[PDB]
Design a protein around this ligand. Structure first.
Ligand SMILES: [Mg+2]
Length: 424
């Protein structure tokens, strides 16, 4: 169905999470410390339940708990600690974690509970849980885990992938499976021939979405997901968080929360360069803060640092500067005024970080690309919708080449007037 009326589809539930009292009694500070010591980050802004820190906090059925304790795990992984409550609460979610973090259990055990709260499969029914994987190897791993944890509940799962004979896969699909772990191409083949359907799938998992996009599976993935009811529960997992994965998540998920495990690495702010001439900067710059509805300006000098600060304070702007020649009491005081909000405009020639960043203005482009990219990194490592402005002027060609290389590696939208400089 390309368009849906969900009131005609069978009803189903998603929220089965019963929070454990040992987790409920955690104060906000204790929850924050627990997330920090496990390197767990929640975007914004988002509505996310408290993380668990023991398997029995999840209140799993005793067969899953039996196999889990038979694995002799000392503790759940951080991605599990934060994804078990999210998934068991029926929330669509995005998980930014590397491989080996334990995401498989994190999306598979809630899938088992989700299926257990549903009626049995009738003849011809498709799978209830669909896990899309980029490679055959990952699909086989996930299927092995799913059979390890679903055999006691008598759940039937299958692995669908190309390069293998179609006979056993068709037989598994026609005899009925509640969990299907598929690669896109073979699954599309089976769907078009009617060997399986998605009318029953209420639990969608997109494993390694970044790899799936990088290998050219986006049209196939979209064709598959278009046939699944939109009121489903969707869990996307990726090792990176670039523009393509963000767009895929906004397209496939509804009211989702994004969580990160490990350090941020690479993060996405609207890096915009404008090519001007020198004496046309100030105008634009004043423009660049007459739209302020918070702001860090970078220059080359300490001389013109103080000069620009004094000139914009002459014009009436609440700007304050910081550099190496200033004392440390003055530095701490200026930073306090910046964080509290009196002086929302900081001007600097540079570890030390501030959290609330709405605009970054490299008033004069640094002489490197490394001096440029780490400013954006320090800014985007915080949670923001910031926009980094830079004032470039067409004097240097190699400089523009390096800047364009950085912008292309950042998946940014280079304005045509900067590409026009090395076009010919
Ligand atoms: Mg394949």
């Amino acid at each position: 169905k390309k368009k849906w009326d969900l009131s005609e589809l069978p009803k189903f539930e998603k929220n089965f999470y019963v929070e454990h009292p040992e987790v409920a009694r955690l104060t906000p500070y204790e929850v924050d410390e627990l997330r920090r010591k496990k390197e767990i980050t929640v975007r914004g802004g988002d509505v996310c339940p408290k993380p668990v820190f023991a398997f029995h906090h999840a209140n799993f059925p005793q067969y899953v708990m039996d196999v889990l304790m038979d694995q002799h795990f000392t503790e759940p992984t951080p991605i599990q600690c934060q994804g078990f409550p999210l998934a068991l609460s029926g929330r669509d979610m995005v998980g930014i974690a590397q491989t080996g973090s334990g995401k498989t259990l994190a999306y598979l055990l809630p899938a088992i509970v989700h299926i257990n709260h549903q009626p049995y499969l009738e003849r011809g029914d498709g799978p209830i849980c669909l896990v899309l994987a980029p490679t055959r190897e990952l699909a086989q791993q996930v299927q092995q885990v799913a059979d390890d944890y679903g055999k006691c509940s008598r759940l039937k799962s299958t692995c669908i992938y190309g390069g293998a004979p179609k006979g056993p896969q068709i037989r598994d699909l026609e005899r009925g499976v509640e969990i299907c772990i598929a690669t896109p191409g073979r699954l599309i083949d089976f769907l078009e021939s009617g060997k399986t359907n998605l009318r029953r799938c209420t639990y969608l998992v997109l494993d390694e979405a970044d790899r799936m996009l990088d290998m050219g599976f986006e049209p196939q993935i979209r064709k598959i997901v278009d046939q699944i009811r939109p009121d489903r529960q969707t869990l996307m997992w990726s090792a990176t968080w670039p523009k393509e994965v963000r767009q895929l998540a906004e397209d496939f998920l509804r009211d989702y929360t994004q969580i990160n495990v490990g350090n941020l690495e690479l993060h996405n702010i609207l890096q915009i360069v404008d090519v001007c001439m020198e004496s046309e900067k100030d105008h634009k710059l004043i423009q660049l803060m007459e739209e302020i509805m918070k702001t860090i300006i970078f220059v080359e000098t300490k001389r013109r640092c103080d000069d620009l600060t004094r000139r914009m304070r002459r014009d009436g702007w609440p700007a304050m500067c910081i550099h190496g020649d200033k004392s440390q009491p003055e530095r701490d005081w200026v930073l306090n005024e910046f964080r509290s909000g009196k002086a929302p405009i900081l001007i600097a020639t540079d570890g030390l970080d501030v959290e609330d960043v709405k605009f970054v203005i490299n008033y004069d482009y640094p002489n490197s690309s490394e001096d440029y990219v780490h400013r954006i990194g320090r800014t985007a490592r915080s949670t923001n919708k910031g926009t980094a402005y830079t004032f470039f002027t067409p004097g240097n060609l190699k400089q523009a080449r390096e800047l364009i290389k950085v912008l292309e590696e950042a998946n940014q939208a280079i304005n045509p007037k900067l590409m026009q400089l090395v076009d010919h």
